[PDB]
Amino acid sequence: HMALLQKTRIINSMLQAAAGKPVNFKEMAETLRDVIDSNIFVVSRRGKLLGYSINQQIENDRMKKMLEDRQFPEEYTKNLFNVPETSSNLDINSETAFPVENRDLFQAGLTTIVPIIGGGERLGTLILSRLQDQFNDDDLILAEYGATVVGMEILREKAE
Amino acid sequence: HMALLQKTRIINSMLQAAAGKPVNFKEMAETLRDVIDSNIFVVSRRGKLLGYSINQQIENDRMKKMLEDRQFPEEYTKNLFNVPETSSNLDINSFPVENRDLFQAGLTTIVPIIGGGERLGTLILSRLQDQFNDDDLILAEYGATVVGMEILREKAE
Numbered sequence: 001h002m003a004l005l006q007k008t009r010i011i012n013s014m015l016q017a018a019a020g021k022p023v024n025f026k027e028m029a030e031t032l033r034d035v036i037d038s039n040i041f042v043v044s045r046r047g048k049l050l051g052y053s054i055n056q057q058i059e060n061d062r063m064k065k066m067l068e069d070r071q072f073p074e075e076y077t078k079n080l081f082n083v084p085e086t087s088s089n090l091d092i093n094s095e096t097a098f099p100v101e102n103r104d105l106f107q108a109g110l111t112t113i114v115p116i117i118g119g120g121e122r123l124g125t126l127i128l129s130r131l132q133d134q135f136n137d138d139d140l141i142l143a144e145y146g147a148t149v150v151g152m153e154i155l156r157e158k159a160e
Numbered sequence: 161h162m163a164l165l166q167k168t169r170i171i172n173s174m175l176q177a178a179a180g181k182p183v184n185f186k187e188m189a190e191t192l193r194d195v196i197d198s199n200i201f202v203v204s205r206r207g208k209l210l211g212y213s214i215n216q217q218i219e220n221d222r223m224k225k226m227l228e229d230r231q232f233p234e235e236y237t238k239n240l241f242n243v244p245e246t247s248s249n250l251d252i253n254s255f256p257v258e259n260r261d262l263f264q265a266g267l268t269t270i271v272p273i274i275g276g277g278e279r280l281g282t283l284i285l286s287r288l289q290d291q292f293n294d295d296d297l298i299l300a301e302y303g304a305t306v307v308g309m310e311i312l313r314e315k316a317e
Contacts, residue, residue: 001161001294008298015175015305019276120178137161141168145302148175 004138007035011145015152023157025051025150032126032146036139041066041127042116042150047077050124050154056131058109063129076102080113080125086144088112088135110134114143118151126150164295167195171302175309183314185211185307192283192303196296201226201284202273202307207237210281210311216288218266223286235259240282246271246301248292267291271300275308283307 014031029040033053041063042050049070066072072080079098090096090111098105105111112135116124126147128135135143174191189200193213201223202210209230226232232240239255248269255262262268269292273281283304285292292300 001164001298004161005294005298008301012301012305016274016308017277117176120176120180137165141161141165141298144168144172148172151176 001138004141007142008145010035011142011149014149023153023160025153026053027051028146028150028153029053032142036128036142036146037130038112038135038139038143039129040146041129042124043072043077043080043127044124044154045081045122047072047074047080056129058129058131060105060107060109060129062104062107076105081122083113083115083125086112086114086140088140112140112143114140114147116147116151116154118148118155123151123154161295164298167299168302170195171299171306174306182317183310185310186213187211188303188307188310189213192299196285196299196303197287198269198292198296198300199286200303201286202281203232203240203284204281204311205241205279207232207234207240216286218286218288220262220264220266220286222261222264236262240270241279243270243272243282246297248297269297269300271297271304273304273308273311275305275312280308280311 025042029042029051030053032040033055039054039056039058041052044050049066079102082097087096090106092106094106109129109131112128114126115122116126126143128143185202189202189211190213192200193215199214199216201212204210209226212227236259239259246269250263250268252263266286266288269285271283272279273283283300285300
């Protein structure tokens with residue numbers, strides 16, 4: 001599992017290294033983009049865009065609007081909060097607990113939703129998207145490791 | 161990689177967890193023992209035994225003495241510090257010669273515990289006969305990070 005081991009080391013060094021620099025969500029998004037090989041969006045518990053990075057353009061009006069608003073609409077924020085654990089490979093044909101009216105979030109590509117949890121609290125949501133390649137268990141290991149680090153840093157920014 | 165994913169979830173929950181209870185190294189050692197399936201020893205940067213858990217007896221008089229003293233001798237503490245990154249599957253055939261009695265029996269993996277960019281201690285793992293693979297290292301290094309998190313938290317208690 002050597003590639004996975006190397007990739008966990010890159011994420012893990014985020015937890016263990018330095019601890020000096022201020023929090024930078026765009027930088028974290030970029031790191032996870034390259035390690036996981038996926039679009040990365042970091043959303044707060046209240047639906048605010050904290051940071052993102054894209055390596056594969058996907059046509060999605062709902063995500064585009066979120067980017068423009070730097071915020072999900074209230075209903076979408078609520079339905080993300082209602083995802084209690086990692087939900088992967090969501091698409092147009094998905095089988096999930098988003099109301100049909102809000103499944104335009106999965107218009108195109110494949111989406112994985114990973115709750116960000118820190119200090120026993122829901123701190124936000126890590127959303128990953130790819131044009132065509134499925135997320136496998138290795139991808140989920142890295143996504144969940146990344147989510148935990150982002151949670152760590154959301155707390156730091158709270159206390160900054 | 162379903163078994164690995166489940167095991168990372170158990171370790172990871174330790175990070176994303178409450179943050180209520182005071183730090184407990186014996187508990188962390190017991191968790192890692194079950195998740196990784198290995199003996200677990202948590203040692204501070206100064207060679208003090210912080211916690212440990214055993215699931216397979218290995219006759220090793222050097223390790224037994226450390227457990228009795230709750231501390232490594234100076235020379236061993238120094239040579240653990242000089243281990244800059246994970247070193248796995250150490251045994252009699254693989255530290256100066258005089259201090260390789262640490263690897264008398266079984267297979268040993270040494271994982272530096274790093275937090276705040278600093279060397280906070282060492283996680284030592286041992287097994288009677290089964291080799292540590294990359295999955296084992298992923299879990300060991302995840303566990304090491306959590307323990308480092310807690311050594312810092314304990315420093316600010």
